[PDB]
Design a protein around this ligand. Structure first.
Ligand SMILES: *[C@@H]1O[C@H](CO)[C@@H](O[C@@H]2O[C@H](CO)[C@@H](O)[C@H](O)[C@H]2NC(C)=O)[C@H](O)[C@H]1NC(C)=O
Ligand SMILES: *[C@@H]1O[C@H](CO)[C@@H](O[C@@H]2O[C@H](CO)[C@@H](O)[C@H](O)[C@H]2NC(C)=O)[C@H](O)[C@H]1NC(C)=O
Ligand SMILES: *[C@@H]1O[C@H](CO)[C@@H](O)[C@H](O)[C@H]1NC(C)=O
Ligand SMILES: *[C@@H]1O[C@H](CO)[C@@H](O)[C@H](O)[C@H]1NC(C)=O
Lengths: 21, 21
């Protein structure tokens, strides 16, 4: 529904921590 | 690079929970 959008990967800080657990 | 700085243990809220898990 948004116009002029782009694609890029946002980083979750919890994701590397929980993956390291 | 900052001036007038001090040292204190800033606290992650994830760290106790993930360490308990
Ligand atoms: C941004 O990401 C979306 C989601 O991956 C892309 O949409 C998909 O594009 C592929 C390739 O054309 C299609 O096979 C999928 O069916 C599309 N999905 C949807 C929900 O439309 C989109 O093309 C990407 N845009 C850019 C500019 O990279
Ligand atoms: C604040 O903390 C930093 C990091 O531990 C201290 O810097 C270290 O101090 C020791 C002791 O003099 C040195 O052996 C290290 O080489 C220092 N490390 C760095 C990266 O500089 C700093 O002294 C502390 N400051 C105060 C006021 O407590
Ligand atoms: C910017 O304008 C061009 C046409 O010159 C168009 O193709 C493009 O989709 C526009 N992009 C945005 C973000 O408005
Ligand atoms: C405050 O002033 C004193 C001199 O009166 C100086 O020695 C000290 O480093 C200064 N501290 C800060 C944080 O500016």
């Amino acid at each position: 529904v948004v116009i002029g959008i782009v694609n890029n990967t946002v980083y979750d800080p919890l994701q590397p921590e929980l993956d390291s657990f």
